[PDB]
Amino acid sequence: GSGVPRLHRPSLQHFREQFLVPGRPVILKGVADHWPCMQKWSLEYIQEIAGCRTVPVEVGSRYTDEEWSQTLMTVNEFISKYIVNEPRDVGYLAQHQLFDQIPELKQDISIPDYCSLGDGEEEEITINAWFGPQGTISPLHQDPQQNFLVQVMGRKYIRLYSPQESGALYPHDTHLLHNTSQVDVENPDLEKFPKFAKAPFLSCILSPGEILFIPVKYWHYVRALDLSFSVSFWWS
Ligand SMILES: C/N=C(/NC)NCCC[C@H](N)C(=O)O
Ligand SMILES: O=C(O)CCC(=O)C(=O)O
Ligand SMILES: [Zn+2]
């Protein structure tokens, strides 16, 4: 496929018309790049503000066979165990609303203006922290709302497949896992999943300051390339 387009602070109507309404992915630059989080958030500072709080942590590379488990620990324990000291397994602080838990971290972000183009209420926008070492993998999956994924620390390799291509992505049959792909994007078994080979996609390397707009129900797979902190806004 091709690289995801990058636009420097598009006007709202131009984002509405070329991207939101047709549902095409884009990176928005010059938008979140000066938010306080971009210069303020570090291991020192995350420990200082959030260190003693309780967070859920996903342990294991990815979630299919339950090797993957979910646990709870303090942010300090997560940093020390899964990031700093030669971790024994991949832990990921994933899909957690950490800014409703620590309001003082919410002062470091904002809700992007483009969300007001939606039909939903600003109070109901779901804000999720994603924080973990180099190498976390979110398997190919789709989400029920629009998403702004704001990169803060580190880089993420991302791949996007359209809803129109779902027939080549082999979703799990169980309605629980309905929206997750059985395919390992970066090493697909093409004996089992042959149609995955021909399906087109976009990909990118998302970097700090940059916002990736993921259209509703667009499939995405995400691998952190460095120690990484992203913040997702689910809106509608
Ligand atoms: C690696 N782990 C992850 N989540 C637990 N990755 C991305 C979130 C996928 C989830 N189905 C969603 O609703 O976005
Ligand atoms: O693991 C990641 O960073 C991707 C998060 C994600 O899937 C989402 O923003 O909905
Ligand atoms: Zn997602």
Author numbering: 181 to 416
Q: What do the study authors state?
A:
Our recent discovery revealed that JMJD5 and JMJD7 specifically make first cleavage at methylarginine sites on histone tails through endopeptidase activities and continue to trim histone tails with aminopeptidase activities to generate “tailless nucleosomes”, which should be overcome by Pol II without further additional assistance, just as that of Archaea bacteria. During our pursuit in the characterization of potential histone arginine demethylases, we found that the catalytic cores of both JMJD5 and JMJD7 specifically cleave arginine methylated histone tails through both endopeptidase and exopeptidase activities. To address these questions, we have determined a series of structures of c-JMJD5, JMJD7, and c-JMJD5 with substrates, coupled with biochemical data. Comparison of c-JMJD5 and JMJD7 structures to those of metalloproteases revealed that both c-JMJD5 and JMJD7 contain basic elements required for hydrolysis, such as similar residues chelating divalent ions (His321, Asp323, and His400 in JMJD5) and rich negatively charged sidechains as proton acceptor (Asp323 and imidic-Gln275 in JMJD5) within the catalytic center of JMJD5.
To investigate the basis of specific recognition and catalysis, we determined the complex structure of c-JMJD5 in the presence of a symmetric dimethyl arginine residue derivative (DM(s)-Arg), Zn2+, and α-KG. Zn2+ substitutes functionally for Fe2+ (see below) and is more stable than Fe2+ in solution. We found that the methyl groups of di-methyl arginine are buried in a negatively charged pocket consisting of one glutamic acid (Glu238), two tyrosines (Tyr243, Tyr272), two tryptophans (Trp248, Trp310), one Ser318, and a portion of α-KG. This configuration is similar to the structure of Tudor domains bound by methylarginine residues. The carboxyl group is coordinated with Zn2+; this structure could mimic the final step of peptidase cleavage with the oxygen of the carbonyl interacting with Zn2+. Interestingly, as pointed out by one of our reviewers, the sidechain of Ser318 makes a hydrogen bond with NE atom of sidechain of methylarginine, the binding should also contribute to the high binding affinity. Based on the complex structure, much higher binding affinity between c-JMJD5 and pH3R2me2a (~0.1 μM) versus Tudor domains and methylarginine containing peptides (~4 μM) can be explained by the presence of additional charge-charge interactions within the methylarginine binding pocket of c-JMJD5 contributed by α-KG and a sidechain of glutamic acid (Glu238). From the complex structure of c-JMJD5 and the methylated arginine derivative, it is clear that α-KG is not only involved in pocket formation, but also forms a salt bridge or hydrogen bond with the methylated guanidine group. α-KG also participates in the chelation of Zn2+ ions. First, the sidechain of methylated arginine docks at the negatively charged pocket with aromatic cage, bringing the carbonyl group of this residue within close proximity to Zn2+.
